[PDB]
Amino acid sequence: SFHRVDQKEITQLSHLGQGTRTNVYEGRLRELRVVLKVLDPSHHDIALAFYETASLMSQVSHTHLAFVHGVCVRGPENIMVTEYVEHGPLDVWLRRERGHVPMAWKMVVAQQLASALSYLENKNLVHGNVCGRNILLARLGLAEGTSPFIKLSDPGVGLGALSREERVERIPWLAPECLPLSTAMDKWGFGATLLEICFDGEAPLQSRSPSEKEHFYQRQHRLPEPSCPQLATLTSQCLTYEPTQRPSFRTILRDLT
Amino acid sequence: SFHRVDQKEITQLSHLGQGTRTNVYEGRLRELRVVLKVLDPSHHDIALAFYETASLMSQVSHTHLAFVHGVCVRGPENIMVTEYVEHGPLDVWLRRERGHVPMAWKMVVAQQLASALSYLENKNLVHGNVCGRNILLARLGLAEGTSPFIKLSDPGVGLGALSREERVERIPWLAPECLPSTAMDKWGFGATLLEICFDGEAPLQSRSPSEKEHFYQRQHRLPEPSCPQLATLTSQCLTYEPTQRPSFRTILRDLTR
């Protein structure tokens, strides 16, 4: 379970984006600043998948995971009330500052992403949506002697409710076993996100057509090596088609530090 | 003197604000994150008050004073290359977080500002523009987190070069004797101490130039702070007799107890 929010406590403001089956808005919680994830009109299947995500996030506590205030369930409306994170999604930032993000900064982001993912591994919980967009910058770490500070977002509508078409869109982040749930899928996610971070918010296959994406996974191909050997080995280990072959986050965090 | 920065070394980024006769931009220095204070096309005396400010800031070193990198000369425009601090101006932050800033937080900021201002007093060096806006937050310190870490900015185009209209615009922070010495920063400190107490809202801010000037001409005194721990300190500071204002050595001593 998750905390219930009455429609009278939440105010909608600026549209920020569009998630899988959702529309992201800025909002107020009665007045604290929040983000409202408004689920589109849906079957009970999708509403339940949205609840599992709120629940996963509601029963966790880590310094590098966004907080969930609860869910507001009305007539045809489901709104996840979540933490507003100052500088927004990392992928957008990495594109804005393309060619000007040092290796040291990216490395911190990776340690923080893996610290957050080691905690869900030990509690045998699956995030299932690791990508640049779901990494939020609480602190930019642009000034000397200041490091970036991340906050991994809620995974949105759970993978179990998405269609093949929607799963194909999640490539290169989607684990190949997930194309047709284990914690090993977040190892593929962490891996494809390392690549996205190295290539300054430009993930491999991102421009490719759904068929070209689907074919790459069907033909069992592998993603490019990054432009920094500081992560080249770690990525090859994570981005293996064999789930059992992927390193544990305990191992990853060791391989980083 | 000060360092000469070529325009090849700098990169102008997003605009942050406007000062007296300047436009403030975020930027890069070849690679550090910097703040570029671009002076408007100016006459040799204005540019000299700008060069004098660069010089003051260049030839001083203090933990709680922002760093000046050098000066660039791009056609009619002069660029003061300064330090980028993580959270920017303090007034902006106090207004944003009004009614959520503990007295302790305000007292750490006060001492830190008195330290910077004592350093310059032992050096017999005036600032001339001590106001909330010229208080930069390197560490936010809410909550706890460790406590805040401010940096007093450069004062921009020196007072001496400004007009009556510009000097009036600096009320309530402008010392009354400066409307028609190191004593002026004691008023500036006092006026800022009110600004910090009233959560970034200074007295006379929203008033007309004639109302502001009239308040000073009629020798009218500013409000008492809602912070009782500062009532006497600011009363001693915000006096119309420069010689009746305490030294920063005294303010610091008093602040500890």
Ligand SMILES: CNC(=O)c1nnc(NC(=O)C2CC2)cc1Nc1cccc(-c2ncccn2)c1OC
């Ligand atoms: C848990 N809190 C959050 O997720 C969240 N928090 N803060 C911000 N702040 C901001 O943006 C700041 C203004 C810059 C944005 C956030 N989410 C967000 C914004 C825009 C698009 C998406 C999206 N979601 C799924 C698919 C695609 N995009 C999205 O969710 C990740």
Ligand SMILES: CNC(=O)c1nnc(NC(=O)C2CC2)cc1Nc1cccc(-c2ncccn2)c1OC
């Ligand atoms: C010496 N370095 C600086 O002054 C300075 N350094 N860092 C930040 N960081 C940021 O903001 C980053 C976004 C967090 C802001 C800074 N200055 C600043 C920002 C915006 C407006 C002004 C202005 N100056 C005079 C009058 C009115 N406004 C201004 O100068 C004080």
